[PDB]
Design an enzyme around this catalytic site. Structure first.
Site, mmCIF file in Angstrom:
data_model
loop_
_atom_site.group_PDB
_atom_site.id
_atom_site.type_symbol
_atom_site.label_atom_id
_atom_site.label_comp_id
_atom_site.label_asym_id
_atom_site.label_seq_id
_atom_site.Cartn_x
_atom_site.Cartn_y
_atom_site.Cartn_z
ATOM 1 N N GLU A 1 0.801 -1.205 0.000
ATOM 2 C CA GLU A 1 0.000 0.000 0.000
ATOM 3 C C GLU A 1 0.845 1.273 0.000
ATOM 4 O OE1 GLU A 1 -3.003 0.126 -0.675
ATOM 5 O OE2 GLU A 1 -3.945 -1.749 -0.024
ATOM 6 N N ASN B 1 -7.969 8.621 -5.788
ATOM 7 C CA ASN B 1 -8.749 7.606 -6.469
ATOM 8 C C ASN B 1 -9.595 8.197 -7.562
ATOM 9 O OD1 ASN B 1 -7.872 5.517 -4.666
ATOM 10 N ND2 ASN B 1 -9.310 6.300 -3.160
ATOM 11 N N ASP C 1 -12.683 7.951 -8.238
ATOM 12 C CA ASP C 1 -13.950 8.486 -7.701
ATOM 13 C C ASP C 1 -13.801 9.842 -6.940
ATOM 14 O OD1 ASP C 1 -12.899 7.682 -5.143
ATOM 15 O OD2 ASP C 1 -14.749 6.823 -4.508
ATOM 16 N N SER D 1 -12.068 10.232 -4.111
ATOM 17 C CA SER D 1 -11.698 10.006 -2.721
ATOM 18 C C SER D 1 -10.116 9.958 -2.731
ATOM 19 C CB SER D 1 -12.274 8.738 -2.141
ATOM 20 O OG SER D 1 -11.810 7.608 -2.871
ATOM 21 N N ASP E 1 -6.660 8.016 -0.603
ATOM 22 C CA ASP E 1 -6.126 7.049 0.335
ATOM 23 C C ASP E 1 -4.925 7.617 1.109
ATOM 24 O OD1 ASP E 1 -7.968 5.215 -0.696
ATOM 25 O OD2 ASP E 1 -6.455 4.050 -1.705
ATOM 26 N N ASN F 1 -9.152 4.937 2.962
ATOM 27 C CA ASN F 1 -9.899 5.687 1.943
ATOM 28 C C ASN F 1 -10.869 6.670 2.612
ATOM 29 O OD1 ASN F 1 -11.511 6.456 -0.266
ATOM 30 N ND2 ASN F 1 -11.458 4.454 -1.279
ATOM 31 N N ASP G 1 -15.253 -5.037 9.173
ATOM 32 C CA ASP G 1 -16.427 -4.492 8.464
ATOM 33 C C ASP G 1 -17.174 -5.602 7.748
ATOM 34 O OD1 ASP G 1 -17.930 -2.144 7.704
ATOM 35 O OD2 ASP G 1 -17.353 -2.556 5.628
#
Ligand code: CL
Ligand code: CL
Ligand code: CL
Ligand code: CL
Ligand code: NA
Ligand code: NA
Ligand code: NA
Ligand code: NA
Ligand code: NA
Ligand code: NA
Ligand code: NA
Ligand code: NA
Length: 129
Positions: A35, A46, A48, A50, A52, A59, A101
């Site tokens: 990562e 990202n 979209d 967003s 990270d 995110n 989650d």
């Protein structure tokens, strides 16, 4: 901060990630490696909109507030900047919520594609823990 391999393993262990939700420490180090290459300051945008943040590239779509991700949540209740600290506490605490989650470490696409099923113990091999 750019951690050393064993240095990060030790910090993650001290913050209770070792075997958290059944994921051995090597899984966590491996995920961090791919990562962020162990750099707490890593950020990546990202498609979209967003972003990270940090060692585990958490995110802003769900987990942290950066003020520029429309329609997002902040489920870790932290500013995304906290995820860039030399002190990994905020990253670890948030990652524990993420891994809980429902999809386990598959939440980290890179963990799925590069760590899952591999010899993750190699990541902590030789480390004094
Ligand atoms: Cl390494
Ligand atoms: Cl391991
Ligand atoms: Cl936002
Ligand atoms: Cl799981
Ligand atoms: Na640095
Ligand atoms: Na598990
Ligand atoms: Na990076
Ligand atoms: Na960055
Ligand atoms: Na963003
Ligand atoms: Na992170
Ligand atoms: Na971090
Ligand atoms: Na937010």
């Amino acid at each position: 901060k750019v951690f050393g391999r064993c240095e990060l393993a030790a910090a993650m262990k001290r913050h209770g990630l070792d075997n958290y939700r059944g994921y051995s420490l090597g899984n966590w180090v491996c995920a961090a490696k791919f990562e962020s290459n162990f750099n707490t300051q890593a950020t990546n945008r990202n498609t979209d909109g967003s972003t990270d943040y940090g060692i585990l590239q958490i995110n802003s779509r769900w987990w942290c507030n950066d003020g520029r991700t429309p329609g997002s949540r902040n489920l870790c209740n932290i500013p995304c900047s906290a995820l860039l600290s030399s002190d990994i506490t905020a990253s670890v605490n948030c990652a524990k919520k993420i891994v809980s989650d429902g999809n386990g470490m598959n939440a980290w696409v890179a963990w799925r594609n590069r760590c899952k099923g591999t010899d993750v113990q190699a990541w902590i091999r030789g480390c004094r823990l």
